[PDB]
């Protein structure tokens, strides 16, 4: 039951080992994990996101956003997994 607090830092790694400077959205963090085949940060990060609920003025985005307009949806285009 004490493991619930151990994950509190896990969600931090998704941004601790990346360049959140410009960006600040999911997918990226899941990329480094998907490099081998992992795929949890997707729903995991989002699940904990609502829990952590970061305060305002912590978006790290003055008045710029390009990666958010590019609408990168090429990932779904390669969606066709299959078990067994």
PDB file of N, CA and C in Angstrom:
ATOM      1  N   UNK A   1       0.826  -1.201   0.000  1.00  0.00           N
ATOM      2  CA  UNK A   1       0.000   0.000   0.000  1.00  0.00           C
ATOM      3  C   UNK A   1       0.865   1.257   0.000  1.00  0.00           C
ATOM      4  N   UNK A   2       2.075   1.135   0.538  1.00  0.00           N
ATOM      5  CA  UNK A   2       3.000   2.259   0.599  1.00  0.00           C
ATOM      6  C   UNK A   2       3.640   2.518  -0.761  1.00  0.00           C
ATOM      7  N   UNK A   3       3.353   1.644  -1.721  1.00  0.00           N
ATOM      8  CA  UNK A   3       3.904   1.776  -3.065  1.00  0.00           C
ATOM      9  C   UNK A   3       3.236   2.924  -3.816  1.00  0.00           C
ATOM     10  N   UNK A   4       2.036   3.291  -3.376  1.00  0.00           N
ATOM     11  CA  UNK A   4       1.288   4.371  -4.008  1.00  0.00           C
ATOM     12  C   UNK A   4       2.099   5.664  -4.012  1.00  0.00           C
ATOM     13  N   UNK A   5       2.926   5.840  -2.986  1.00  0.00           N
ATOM     14  CA  UNK A   5       3.757   7.031  -2.870  1.00  0.00           C
ATOM     15  C   UNK A   5       5.035   6.893  -3.689  1.00  0.00           C
ATOM     16  N   UNK A   6       5.444   5.653  -3.934  1.00  0.00           N
ATOM     17  CA  UNK A   6       6.649   5.385  -4.708  1.00  0.00           C
ATOM     18  C   UNK A   6       6.460   5.776  -6.171  1.00  0.00           C
ATOM     19  N   UNK A   7       5.215   5.737  -6.633  1.00  0.00           N
ATOM     20  CA  UNK A   7       4.903   6.088  -8.012  1.00  0.00           C
ATOM     21  C   UNK A   7       4.869   7.601  -8.201  1.00  0.00           C
ATOM     22  N   UNK A   8       4.675   8.325  -7.103  1.00  0.00           N
ATOM     23  CA  UNK A   8       4.622   9.781  -7.147  1.00  0.00           C
ATOM     24  C   UNK A   8       5.856  10.349  -7.842  1.00  0.00           C
ATOM     25  N   UNK A   9       6.966   9.622  -7.753  1.00  0.00           N
ATOM     26  CA  UNK A   9       8.212  10.052  -8.375  1.00  0.00           C
ATOM     27  C   UNK A   9       8.335   9.507  -9.794  1.00  0.00           C
ATOM     28  N   UNK A  10       7.651   8.400 -10.058  1.00  0.00           N
ATOM     29  CA  UNK A  10       7.683   7.777 -11.377  1.00  0.00           C
ATOM     30  C   UNK A  10       7.230   8.757 -12.454  1.00  0.00           C
ATOM     31  N   UNK A  11       6.094   9.404 -12.218  1.00  0.00           N
ATOM     32  CA  UNK A  11       5.553  10.370 -13.165  1.00  0.00           C
ATOM     33  C   UNK A  11       6.522  11.525 -13.386  1.00  0.00           C
ATOM     34  N   UNK A  12       7.463  11.685 -12.461  1.00  0.00           N
ATOM     35  CA  UNK A  12       8.454  12.751 -12.554  1.00  0.00           C
ATOM     36  C   UNK A  12       9.572  12.371 -13.519  1.00  0.00           C
ATOM     37  N   UNK A  13       9.838  11.073 -13.628  1.00  0.00           N
ATOM     38  CA  UNK A  13      10.881  10.578 -14.518  1.00  0.00           C
ATOM     39  C   UNK A  13      10.510  10.815 -15.978  1.00  0.00           C
ATOM     40  N   UNK A  14       9.215  10.747 -16.273  1.00  0.00           N
ATOM     41  CA  UNK A  14       8.728  10.956 -17.631  1.00  0.00           C
ATOM     42  C   UNK A  14       9.116  12.340 -18.143  1.00  0.00           C
ATOM     43  N   UNK A  15       9.420  13.243 -17.217  1.00  0.00           N
ATOM     44  CA  UNK A  15       9.811  14.601 -17.575  1.00  0.00           C
ATOM     45  C   UNK A  15      11.220  14.916 -17.081  1.00  0.00           C
ATOM     46  N   UNK A  16      11.755  14.040 -16.238  1.00  0.00           N
ATOM     47  CA  UNK A  16      13.095  14.222 -15.695  1.00  0.00           C
ATOM     48  C   UNK A  16      14.157  13.791 -16.700  1.00  0.00           C
ATOM     49  N   UNK A  17      13.792  12.864 -17.579  1.00  0.00           N
ATOM     50  CA  UNK A  17      14.714  12.367 -18.594  1.00  0.00           C
ATOM     51  C   UNK A  17      14.290  12.816 -19.988  1.00  0.00           C
ATOM     52  N   UNK A  18      13.827  14.058 -20.090  1.00  0.00           N
ATOM     53  CA  UNK A  18      13.388  14.607 -21.368  1.00  0.00           C
ATOM     54  C   UNK A  18      13.649  16.109 -21.434  1.00  0.00           C
ATOM     55  N   UNK A  19      13.199  16.735 -22.517  1.00  0.00           N
ATOM     56  CA  UNK A  19      13.386  18.170 -22.704  1.00  0.00           C
ATOM     57  C   UNK A  19      12.048  18.901 -22.660  1.00  0.00           C
ATOM     58  N   UNK A  20      11.481  19.026 -21.451  1.00  0.00           N
ATOM     59  CA  UNK A  20      10.197  19.704 -21.245  1.00  0.00           C
ATOM     60  C   UNK A  20      10.295  21.210 -21.463  1.00  0.00           C
ATOM     61  N   UNK A  21      11.500  21.681 -21.769  1.00  0.00           N
ATOM     62  CA  UNK A  21      11.726  23.102 -22.005  1.00  0.00           C
ATOM     63  C   UNK A  21      10.675  23.677 -22.947  1.00  0.00           C
ATOM     64  N   UNK A  22      10.709  23.243 -24.202  1.00  0.00           N
ATOM     65  CA  UNK A  22       9.759  23.713 -25.202  1.00  0.00           C
ATOM     66  C   UNK A  22       8.423  22.988 -25.067  1.00  0.00           C
ATOM     67  N   UNK A  23       8.448  21.660 -25.251  1.00  0.00           N
ATOM     68  CA  UNK A  23       7.248  20.824 -25.152  1.00  0.00           C
ATOM     69  C   UNK A  23       6.735  20.714 -23.721  1.00  0.00           C
ATOM     70  N   UNK A  24       5.607  20.030 -23.553  1.00  0.00           N
ATOM     71  CA  UNK A  24       5.011  19.851 -22.234  1.00  0.00           C
ATOM     72  C   UNK A  24       3.772  18.965 -22.312  1.00  0.00           C
ATOM     73  N   UNK A  25       3.757  18.064 -23.289  1.00  0.00           N
ATOM     74  CA  UNK A  25       2.630  17.156 -23.473  1.00  0.00           C
ATOM     75  C   UNK A  25       3.089  15.702 -23.423  1.00  0.00           C
ATOM     76  N   UNK A  26       2.131  14.789 -23.320  1.00  0.00           N
ATOM     77  CA  UNK A  26       2.434  13.364 -23.263  1.00  0.00           C
ATOM     78  C   UNK A  26       3.016  12.880 -24.588  1.00  0.00           C
ATOM     79  N   UNK A  27       2.930  11.574 -24.824  1.00  0.00           N
ATOM     80  CA  UNK A  27       3.453  10.983 -26.049  1.00  0.00           C
ATOM     81  C   UNK A  27       4.976  10.901 -26.007  1.00  0.00           C
ATOM     82  N   UNK A  28       5.623  12.059 -25.960  1.00  0.00           N
ATOM     83  CA  UNK A  28       7.080  12.122 -25.914  1.00  0.00           C
ATOM     84  C   UNK A  28       7.630  11.206 -24.826  1.00  0.00           C
ATOM     85  N   UNK A  29       7.178  11.419 -23.595  1.00  0.00           N
ATOM     86  CA  UNK A  29       7.623  10.612 -22.465  1.00  0.00           C
ATOM     87  C   UNK A  29       7.389   9.128 -22.730  1.00  0.00           C
ATOM     88  N   UNK A  30       6.313   8.824 -23.450  1.00  0.00           N
ATOM     89  CA  UNK A  30       5.977   7.443 -23.774  1.00  0.00           C
ATOM     90  C   UNK A  30       6.834   6.924 -24.923  1.00  0.00           C
ATOM     91  N   UNK A  31       7.437   7.844 -25.668  1.00  0.00           N
ATOM     92  CA  UNK A  31       8.282   7.478 -26.799  1.00  0.00           C
ATOM     93  C   UNK A  31       9.508   6.698 -26.331  1.00  0.00           C
ATOM     94  N   UNK A  32      10.248   7.278 -25.393  1.00  0.00           N
ATOM     95  CA  UNK A  32      11.445   6.638 -24.858  1.00  0.00           C
ATOM     96  C   UNK A  32      11.126   5.247 -24.321  1.00  0.00           C
ATOM     97  N   UNK A  33       9.896   5.069 -23.851  1.00  0.00           N
ATOM     98  CA  UNK A  33       9.463   3.785 -23.311  1.00  0.00           C
ATOM     99  C   UNK A  33       9.013   2.848 -24.428  1.00  0.00           C
ATOM    100  N   UNK A  34       8.379   3.415 -25.449  1.00  0.00           N
ATOM    101  CA  UNK A  34       7.897   2.630 -26.579  1.00  0.00           C
ATOM    102  C   UNK A  34       9.056   2.180 -27.463  1.00  0.00           C
ATOM    103  N   UNK A  35      10.228   2.767 -27.236  1.00  0.00           N
ATOM    104  CA  UNK A  35      11.414   2.428 -28.013  1.00  0.00           C
ATOM    105  C   UNK A  35      11.700   0.931 -27.942  1.00  0.00           C
ATOM    106  N   UNK A  36      11.334   0.316 -26.821  1.00  0.00           N
ATOM    107  CA  UNK A  36      11.552  -1.112 -26.628  1.00  0.00           C
ATOM    108  C   UNK A  36      10.251  -1.890 -26.794  1.00  0.00           C
ATOM    109  N   UNK A  37       9.133  -1.227 -26.514  1.00  0.00           N
ATOM    110  CA  UNK A  37       7.839  -1.872 -26.638  1.00  0.00           C
ATOM    111  C   UNK A  37       6.897  -1.507 -25.507  1.00  0.00           C
ATOM    112  N   UNK A  38       7.413  -0.776 -24.525  1.00  0.00           N
ATOM    113  CA  UNK A  38       6.610  -0.361 -23.380  1.00  0.00           C
ATOM    114  C   UNK A  38       5.498   0.592 -23.806  1.00  0.00           C
ATOM    115  N   UNK A  39       4.419   0.618 -23.029  1.00  0.00           N
ATOM    116  CA  UNK A  39       3.286   1.487 -23.325  1.00  0.00           C
ATOM    117  C   UNK A  39       2.366   1.611 -22.115  1.00  0.00           C
ATOM    118  N   UNK A  40       2.816   2.351 -21.107  1.00  0.00           N
ATOM    119  CA  UNK A  40       2.032   2.550 -19.894  1.00  0.00           C
ATOM    120  C   UNK A  40       1.867   4.032 -19.582  1.00  0.00           C
ATOM    121  N   UNK A  41       2.947   4.790 -19.745  1.00  0.00           N
ATOM    122  CA  UNK A  41       2.920   6.224 -19.483  1.00  0.00           C
ATOM    123  C   UNK A  41       1.730   6.885 -20.169  1.00  0.00           C
ATOM    124  N   UNK A  42       1.293   6.300 -21.280  1.00  0.00           N
ATOM    125  CA  UNK A  42       0.163   6.835 -22.031  1.00  0.00           C
ATOM    126  C   UNK A  42      -1.027   7.092 -21.113  1.00  0.00           C
ATOM    127  N   UNK A  43      -1.580   6.020 -20.554  1.00  0.00           N
ATOM    128  CA  UNK A  43      -2.724   6.130 -19.657  1.00  0.00           C
ATOM    129  C   UNK A  43      -2.270   6.396 -18.225  1.00  0.00           C
ATOM    130  N   UNK A  44      -1.107   5.859 -17.869  1.00  0.00           N
ATOM    131  CA  UNK A  44      -0.562   6.036 -16.529  1.00  0.00           C
ATOM    132  C   UNK A  44      -0.363   7.512 -16.207  1.00  0.00           C
ATOM    133  N   UNK A  45       0.487   8.174 -16.985  1.00  0.00           N
ATOM    134  CA  UNK A  45       0.764   9.592 -16.783  1.00  0.00           C
ATOM    135  C   UNK A  45      -0.529  10.394 -16.677  1.00  0.00           C
ATOM    136  N   UNK A  46      -1.474  10.104 -17.564  1.00  0.00           N
ATOM    137  CA  UNK A  46      -2.757  10.796 -17.569  1.00  0.00           C
ATOM    138  C   UNK A  46      -3.547  10.496 -16.299  1.00  0.00           C
ATOM    139  N   UNK A  47      -3.502   9.241 -15.863  1.00  0.00           N
ATOM    140  CA  UNK A  47      -4.213   8.824 -14.660  1.00  0.00           C
ATOM    141  C   UNK A  47      -3.692   9.568 -13.435  1.00  0.00           C
ATOM    142  N   UNK A  48      -2.372   9.681 -13.334  1.00  0.00           N
ATOM    143  CA  UNK A  48      -1.749  10.368 -12.209  1.00  0.00           C
ATOM    144  C   UNK A  48      -1.840  11.881 -12.376  1.00  0.00           C
ATOM    145  N   UNK A  49      -1.912  12.329 -13.626  1.00  0.00           N
ATOM    146  CA  UNK A  49      -2.004  13.753 -13.924  1.00  0.00           C
ATOM    147  C   UNK A  49      -3.137  14.403 -13.133  1.00  0.00           C
ATOM    148  N   UNK A  50      -4.320  13.803 -13.204  1.00  0.00           N
ATOM    149  CA  UNK A  50      -5.483  14.324 -12.496  1.00  0.00           C
ATOM    150  C   UNK A  50      -5.268  14.276 -10.986  1.00  0.00           C
ATOM    151  N   UNK A  51      -4.375  13.393 -10.550  1.00  0.00           N
ATOM    152  CA  UNK A  51      -4.079  13.244  -9.129  1.00  0.00           C
ATOM    153  C   UNK A  51      -3.132  14.341  -8.653  1.00  0.00           C
ATOM    154  N   UNK A  52      -1.973  14.433  -9.296  1.00  0.00           N
ATOM    155  CA  UNK A  52      -0.979  15.439  -8.939  1.00  0.00           C
ATOM    156  C   UNK A  52      -1.564  16.844  -9.042  1.00  0.00           C
ATOM    157  N   UNK A  53      -2.183  17.141 -10.180  1.00  0.00           N
ATOM    158  CA  UNK A  53      -2.784  18.450 -10.405  1.00  0.00           C
ATOM    159  C   UNK A  53      -1.787  19.565 -10.105  1.00  0.00           C
ATOM    160  N   UNK A  54      -0.887  19.816 -11.050  1.00  0.00           N
ATOM    161  CA  UNK A  54       0.121  20.856 -10.888  1.00  0.00           C
ATOM    162  C   UNK A  54      -0.519  22.239 -10.850  1.00  0.00           C
ATOM    163  N   UNK A  55       0.056  23.135 -10.034  1.00  0.00           N
ATOM    164  CA  UNK A  55      -0.440  24.507  -9.887  1.00  0.00           C
ATOM    165  C   UNK A  55      -0.199  25.346 -11.138  1.00  0.00           C
ATOM    166  N   UNK A  56      -0.844  26.521 -11.197  1.00  0.00           N
ATOM    167  CA  UNK A  56      -0.713  27.439 -12.331  1.00  0.00           C
ATOM    168  C   UNK A  56       0.668  28.081 -12.402  1.00  0.00           C
ATOM    169  N   UNK A  57       0.934  28.783 -13.499  1.00  0.00           N
ATOM    170  CA  UNK A  57       2.219  29.445 -13.690  1.00  0.00           C
ATOM    171  C   UNK A  57       3.349  28.423 -13.779  1.00  0.00           C
ATOM    172  N   UNK A  58       2.982  27.161 -13.981  1.00  0.00           N
ATOM    173  CA  UNK A  58       3.963  26.087 -14.083  1.00  0.00           C
ATOM    174  C   UNK A  58       3.823  25.347 -15.411  1.00  0.00           C
ATOM    175  N   UNK A  59       3.298  26.041 -16.416  1.00  0.00           N
ATOM    176  CA  UNK A  59       3.111  25.449 -17.735  1.00  0.00           C
ATOM    177  C   UNK A  59       4.392  25.539 -18.559  1.00  0.00           C
ATOM    178  N   UNK A  60       5.276  26.452 -18.172  1.00  0.00           N
ATOM    179  CA  UNK A  60       6.538  26.640 -18.876  1.00  0.00           C
ATOM    180  C   UNK A  60       6.298  26.989 -20.341  1.00  0.00           C
ATOM    181  N   UNK A  61       5.400  27.940 -20.578  1.00  0.00           N
ATOM    182  CA  UNK A  61       5.077  28.368 -21.934  1.00  0.00           C
ATOM    183  C   UNK A  61       4.605  29.818 -21.949  1.00  0.00           C
ATOM    184  N   UNK A  62       5.539  30.738 -22.165  1.00  0.00           N
ATOM    185  CA  UNK A  62       5.217  32.159 -22.203  1.00  0.00           C
ATOM    186  C   UNK A  62       4.082  32.433 -23.185  1.00  0.00           C
ATOM    187  N   UNK A  63       4.394  32.372 -24.474  1.00  0.00           N
ATOM    188  CA  UNK A  63       3.400  32.614 -25.515  1.00  0.00           C
ATOM    189  C   UNK A  63       3.826  31.978 -26.834  1.00  0.00           C
ATOM    190  N   UNK A  64       4.234  30.714 -26.771  1.00  0.00           N
ATOM    191  CA  UNK A  64       4.664  29.991 -27.962  1.00  0.00           C
ATOM    192  C   UNK A  64       4.186  28.544 -27.928  1.00  0.00           C
ATOM    193  N   UNK A  65       3.823  28.019 -29.093  1.00  0.00           N
ATOM    194  CA  UNK A  65       3.349  26.644 -29.199  1.00  0.00           C
ATOM    195  C   UNK A  65       3.223  26.216 -30.657  1.00  0.00           C
ATOM    196  N   UNK A  66       4.209  25.464 -31.135  1.00  0.00           N
ATOM    197  CA  UNK A  66       4.209  24.991 -32.514  1.00  0.00           C
ATOM    198  C   UNK A  66       3.902  23.497 -32.576  1.00  0.00           C
ATOM    199  N   UNK A  67       4.567  22.727 -31.722  1.00  0.00           N
ATOM    200  CA  UNK A  67       4.369  21.282 -31.681  1.00  0.00           C
ATOM    201  C   UNK A  67       2.913  20.942 -31.381  1.00  0.00           C
ATOM    202  N   UNK A  68       2.201  21.892 -30.781  1.00  0.00           N
ATOM    203  CA  UNK A  68       0.799  21.693 -30.435  1.00  0.00           C
ATOM    204  C   UNK A  68      -0.102  21.983 -31.632  1.00  0.00           C
ATOM    205  N   UNK A  69       0.445  22.679 -32.622  1.00  0.00           N
ATOM    206  CA  UNK A  69      -0.310  23.027 -33.821  1.00  0.00           C
ATOM    207  C   UNK A  69      -0.008  22.051 -34.954  1.00  0.00           C
ATOM    208  N   UNK A  70       1.191  21.476 -34.928  1.00  0.00           N
ATOM    209  CA  UNK A  70       1.604  20.524 -35.952  1.00  0.00           C
ATOM    210  C   UNK A  70       0.642  19.344 -36.026  1.00  0.00           C
ATOM    211  N   UNK A  71      -0.075  19.103 -34.933  1.00  0.00           N
ATOM    212  CA  UNK A  71      -1.033  18.005 -34.874  1.00  0.00           C
ATOM    213  C   UNK A  71      -0.379  16.691 -35.290  1.00  0.00           C
ATOM    214  N   UNK A  72       0.663  16.300 -34.565  1.00  0.00           N
ATOM    215  CA  UNK A  72       1.378  15.062 -34.857  1.00  0.00           C
ATOM    216  C   UNK A  72       0.501  13.847 -34.570  1.00  0.00           C
ATOM    217  N   UNK A  73      -0.068  13.272 -35.624  1.00  0.00           N
ATOM    218  CA  UNK A  73      -0.927  12.101 -35.485  1.00  0.00           C
ATOM    219  C   UNK A  73      -0.407  10.941 -36.327  1.00  0.00           C
ATOM    220  N   UNK A  74       0.882  10.979 -36.647  1.00  0.00           N
ATOM    221  CA  UNK A  74       1.503   9.929 -37.443  1.00  0.00           C
ATOM    222  C   UNK A  74       1.613   8.631 -36.651  1.00  0.00           C
ATOM    223  N   UNK A  75       1.571   8.746 -35.328  1.00  0.00           N
ATOM    224  CA  UNK A  75       1.665   7.580 -34.456  1.00  0.00           C
ATOM    225  C   UNK A  75       0.487   6.635 -34.676  1.00  0.00           C
ATOM    226  N   UNK A  76      -0.720   7.190 -34.665  1.00  0.00           N
ATOM    227  CA  UNK A  76      -1.927   6.396 -34.864  1.00  0.00           C
ATOM    228  C   UNK A  76      -1.919   5.719 -36.231  1.00  0.00           C
ATOM    229  N   UNK A  77      -1.299   6.373 -37.206  1.00  0.00           N
ATOM    230  CA  UNK A  77      -1.222   5.835 -38.559  1.00  0.00           C
ATOM    231  C   UNK A  77      -0.522   4.479 -38.567  1.00  0.00           C
ATOM    232  N   UNK A  78       0.342   4.259 -37.582  1.00  0.00           N
ATOM    233  CA  UNK A  78       1.074   3.003 -37.474  1.00  0.00           C
ATOM    234  C   UNK A  78       0.447   2.095 -36.420  1.00  0.00           C
ATOM    235  N   UNK A  79      -0.838   2.306 -36.156  1.00  0.00           N
ATOM    236  CA  UNK A  79      -1.557   1.507 -35.169  1.00  0.00           C
ATOM    237  C   UNK A  79      -2.148   0.255 -35.810  1.00  0.00           C
ATOM    238  N   UNK A  80      -1.627  -0.904 -35.421  1.00  0.00           N
ATOM    239  CA  UNK A  80      -2.103  -2.175 -35.959  1.00  0.00           C
ATOM    240  C   UNK A  80      -1.509  -3.348 -35.187  1.00  0.00           C
ATOM    241  N   UNK A  81      -1.361  -3.175 -33.877  1.00  0.00           N
ATOM    242  CA  UNK A  81      -0.804  -4.219 -33.026  1.00  0.00           C
ATOM    243  C   UNK A  81      -1.653  -5.486 -33.093  1.00  0.00           C
ATOM    244  N   UNK A  82      -1.088  -6.597 -32.631  1.00  0.00           N
ATOM    245  CA  UNK A  82      -1.793  -7.874 -32.640  1.00  0.00           C
ATOM    246  C   UNK A  82      -1.054  -8.908 -31.797  1.00  0.00           C
ATOM    247  N   UNK A  83      -1.734  -9.431 -30.781  1.00  0.00           N
ATOM    248  CA  UNK A  83      -1.142 -10.430 -29.899  1.00  0.00           C
ATOM    249  C   UNK A  83      -1.345 -11.836 -30.455  1.00  0.00           C
ATOM    250  N   UNK A  84      -0.408 -12.729 -30.152  1.00  0.00           N
ATOM    251  CA  UNK A  84      -0.487 -14.108 -30.622  1.00  0.00           C
ATOM    252  C   UNK A  84      -0.554 -14.160 -32.146  1.00  0.00           C
TER     253      UNK A  84
END
